[PDB]
Amino acid sequence: MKNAAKIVNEALNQGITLFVSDNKLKYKTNRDSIPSELLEEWKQHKQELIDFLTQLESEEES
Protein backbone atom coordinates (compact mmCIF):
# COMPACT_ATOMS: atom_id res chain seq x y z
CA MET A 1 0.00 0.00 0.00
CA LYS A 2 1.71 3.19 -1.21
CA ASN A 3 1.53 6.65 0.40
CA ALA A 4 2.28 10.20 -0.80
CA ALA A 5 6.07 9.91 -0.18
CA LYS A 6 6.21 6.62 -2.12
CA ILE A 7 4.96 8.27 -5.32
CA VAL A 8 7.08 11.42 -4.65
CA ASN A 9 10.26 9.28 -4.53
CA GLU A 10 9.14 7.46 -7.71
CA ALA A 11 8.91 10.86 -9.45
CA LEU A 12 12.47 11.84 -8.43
CA ASN A 13 13.81 8.48 -9.70
CA GLN A 14 12.34 9.19 -13.17
CA GLY A 15 13.82 12.74 -13.05
CA ILE A 16 10.62 14.55 -11.95
CA THR A 17 9.73 16.73 -8.92
CA LEU A 18 6.23 16.66 -7.43
CA PHE A 19 5.33 20.02 -5.83
CA VAL A 20 1.84 21.45 -5.17
CA SER A 21 0.66 24.87 -6.34
CA ASP A 22 -2.66 26.45 -5.18
CA ASN A 23 -3.43 23.26 -3.19
CA LYS A 24 -3.34 21.30 -6.41
CA LEU A 25 -0.84 18.49 -6.79
CA LYS A 26 1.66 19.65 -9.39
CA TYR A 27 4.73 18.08 -11.06
CA LYS A 28 7.94 19.55 -12.61
CA THR A 29 10.42 17.81 -14.95
CA ASN A 30 13.07 18.46 -17.63
CA ARG A 31 11.57 15.75 -19.94
CA ASP A 32 7.95 15.55 -21.10
CA SER A 33 8.15 11.80 -21.88
CA ILE A 34 7.33 10.96 -18.25
CA PRO A 35 5.62 7.56 -17.63
CA SER A 36 1.82 7.80 -17.97
CA GLU A 37 1.52 5.79 -14.69
CA LEU A 38 2.62 8.92 -12.77
CA LEU A 39 -0.23 11.05 -14.17
CA GLU A 40 -2.74 8.46 -12.91
CA GLU A 41 -1.18 7.61 -9.52
CA TRP A 42 -0.69 11.33 -8.87
CA LYS A 43 -4.43 11.90 -9.45
CA GLN A 44 -5.29 8.71 -7.46
CA HIS A 45 -3.40 9.92 -4.37
CA LYS A 46 -3.60 13.70 -5.13
CA GLN A 47 -5.35 14.28 -1.80
CA GLU A 48 -2.60 12.71 0.35
CA LEU A 49 0.13 13.91 -2.06
CA ILE A 50 -0.97 17.53 -1.47
CA ASP A 51 -1.13 17.05 2.30
CA PHE A 52 2.43 15.69 2.40
CA LEU A 53 3.91 17.96 -0.30
CA THR A 54 2.43 21.10 1.26
CA GLN A 55 3.41 20.32 4.87
CA LEU A 56 6.98 19.75 3.66
CA GLU A 57 6.81 23.07 1.72
CA SER A 58 6.41 24.78 5.14
CA GLU A 59 9.93 23.72 6.29
CA GLU A 60 13.38 24.57 4.86
CA GLU A 61 14.82 20.99 4.84
CA SER A 62 14.29 17.86 7.02
Q: In terms of residue numbers, what domain contains 24?
A: 1-62
N-to-C CA span, the chain: 24
Alpha-helical regions (H) of 1-62: 4-13, 36-44, 46-57
PDB experimental method: NMR
Domain count, the chain: 1
Eight-class DSSP state of 61: -
Task: Give me the sign of the Cα torsion angle 32, 38, 40, 45.
Answer: negative
The CA R_g of the chain, rounded to the nearest whole Å, is 11
> Contact 35/29 with Cβ under 8 angstroms?
no
Please tell me the distance from the alpha carbon of residue 21 to that of residue 34, in angstroms, as a whole number.
19
Q: How many CB atoms lie within 10 A of CB 52?
A: 19
Let me know: does 4 contact 51? Beta carbons within 8 Å: yes
How far is 3 from 43, CA to CA, in rounded Å? 13
For residue 4, with 0-12 CB atoms within 10 Å meaning exposed, 13-18 middle and 19 or more buried, which class applies? buried
Burial of residue 53 (number of CB atoms within 10 Å: 0-12, 13-18, 19+): buried
